[PDB]
Amino acid sequence: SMKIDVVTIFPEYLQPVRQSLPGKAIDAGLVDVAVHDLRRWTHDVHKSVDDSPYGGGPGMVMKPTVWGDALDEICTSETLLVVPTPAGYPFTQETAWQWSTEDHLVIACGRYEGIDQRVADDAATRMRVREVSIGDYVLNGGEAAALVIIEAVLRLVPGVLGSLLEGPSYTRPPSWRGMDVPPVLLSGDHAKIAAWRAEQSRQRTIERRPDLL
Amino acid sequence: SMKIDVVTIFPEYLQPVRQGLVDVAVHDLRRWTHDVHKSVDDSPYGGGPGMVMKPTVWGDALDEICTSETLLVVPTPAGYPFTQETAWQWSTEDHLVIACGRYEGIDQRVADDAATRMRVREVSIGDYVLNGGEAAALVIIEAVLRLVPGVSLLEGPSYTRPPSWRGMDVPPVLLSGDHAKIAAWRAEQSRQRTIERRPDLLGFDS
Ligand SMILES: NCc1ccc(-c2ccccc2)nc1
Numbered sequence: 001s002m003k004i005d006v007v008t009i010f011p012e013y014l015q016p017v018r019q020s021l022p023g024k025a026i027d028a029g030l031v032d033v034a035v036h037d038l039r040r041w042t043h044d045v046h047k048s049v050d051d052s053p054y055g056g057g058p059g060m061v062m063k064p065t066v067w068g069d070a071l072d073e074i075c076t077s078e079t080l081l082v083v084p085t086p087a088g089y090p091f092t093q094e095t096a097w098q099w100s101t102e103d104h105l106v107i108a109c110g111r112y113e114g115i116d117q118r119v120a121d122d123a124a125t126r127m128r129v130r131e132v133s134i135g136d137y138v139l140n141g142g143e144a145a146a147l148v149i150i151e152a153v154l155r156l157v158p159g160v161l162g163s164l165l166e167g168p169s170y171t172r173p174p175s176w177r178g179m180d181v182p183p184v185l186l187s188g189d190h191a192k193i194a195a196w197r198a199e200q201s202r203q204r205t206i207e208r209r210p211d212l213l
Numbered sequence: 214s215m216k217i218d219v220v221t222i223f224p225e226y227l228q229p230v231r232q233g234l235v236d237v238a239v240h241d242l243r244r245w246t247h248d249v250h251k252s253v254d255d256s257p258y259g260g261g262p263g264m265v266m267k268p269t270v271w272g273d274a275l276d277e278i279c280t281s282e283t284l285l286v287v288p289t290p291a292g293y294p295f296t297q298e299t300a301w302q303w304s305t306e307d308h309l310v311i312a313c314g315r316y317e318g319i320d321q322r323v324a325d326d327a328a329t330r331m332r333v334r335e336v337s338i339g340d341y342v343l344n345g346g347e348a349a350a351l352v353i354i355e356a357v358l359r360l361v362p363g364v365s366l367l368e369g370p371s372y373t374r375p376p377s378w379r380g381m382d383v384p385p386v387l388l389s390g391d392h393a394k395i396a397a398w399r400a401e402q403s404r405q406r407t408i409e410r411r412p413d414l415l416g417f418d419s
């Protein structure tokens with residue numbers, strides 16, 4: 001049973017998540033994803049969420065007063081606050097397994113040049129906070145990273161969504177455009193098949209990800 | 214100028230992409246089936262759990278959408294790493310086609326056949342498993358498109374007004390107007406954050 005709240009100035013971006021959720025999981029009360037427009041917590045008639053950086057430089061920084069009010073309303077002492085950022089600790093499969101048993105994730109999606117650092121520093125005095133990156137590239141905002149995190153975590157929760165690298169896979173037909181399925185896979189020698197698959201995995205890992213060796 | 218075509222059995226998942234020099238189009242793989250059931254998958258040769266996407270339907274789809282100049286992109290956790298360097302490289306391409314798998318992935322002969330007539334790249338966006346390639350497609354599209362003409366270390370912390378908030382102050386050097394001192398402080402904060410969170414970037418363990 002997990003609740004996820006996402007906060008963003010582009011709530012429409014998170015619509016695929018709500019679409020991916022099976023009715024059985026929702027009906028059984030196993031999962032609830034809610035999306036919130038950050039501008040609900042703005043203070044001025046222009047609904048301002050950003051301002052110029054102290055110390056100068058290009059771009060804009062998201063305002064601490066707006067984010068502080070949003071997180072005060074949505075978070076509790078039991079919340080795990082997730083902040084996607086290219087400057088974060090790495091998000092990996094082990095991270096996804098750890099977070100899959102949490103009761104409440106709140107995901108804070110930044111835009112522009114990111115969020116005033118005092119927002120995370122203040123939140124960390126009363127809840128657990130995790131700044132994370134999903135890979136070594138810069139996006140326009142945190143929304144696409146939030147989609148990846150939500151999918152990787154929820155597929156590990158029982159019944160919600162419905163080392164070495166993996167080697168190649170095959171199915172029918174046995175011959176296609178001049179290429180045959182490797183005959184060992186049709187041999188009925190299942191110890192030999194497992195050894196063949198292990199070697200394919202070793203070779204693919206050497207070629208594509210030597211860091212893993 | 215870039216065209217991006219995405220092929221998927223869940224075209225609705227690609228909706229967030231709606232955010233003149235670039236065009237993105239989304240195609241339902243089932244358009245290229247021929248049976249009434251529109252079957253795209255079958256059990257794996259050699260055993261194992263799950264299902265594999267059939268090569269026949271994929272071959273017909275890519276025949277229609279791709280040319281010899283196409284860069285065919287296939288997201289997979291078993292791929293070469295997609296990084297900022299990759300994004301710069303792909304930013305000057307005329308035509309990307311992104312093939313999104315589901316189930317346990319796509320029959321390997323699809324990529325092998327395509328490679329006889331165009332350039333093919335199997336890539337991973339990070340070390341985690343998804344239920345399909347669609348979310349990875351969205352990450353790749355965003356990282357590439359922001360670099361298209363006409364559109365190291367970790368960055369340190371940023372701040373904006375007010376200078377004091379909830380009893381927490383913006384670092385005084387940032388209010389001092391001293392460009393040399395500010396540059397030096399920011400360089401230090403970046404290198405400090407990098408050794409703490411990403412020691413691999415500076416050539417250290419873990
Ligand atoms: N994990 C990769 C990642 C995450 C977040 C952002 C991002 C970009 C702009 C503003 C705020 C966050 N970029 C990359």
Ligand SMILES: NCc1ccc(-c2ccccc2)nc1
Binds near residue numbers: 315336
């Ligand atoms: N780059 C990470 C990544 C990419 C693709 C997939 C995936 C999952 C299931 C089926 C087909 C592709 N998973 C993770």
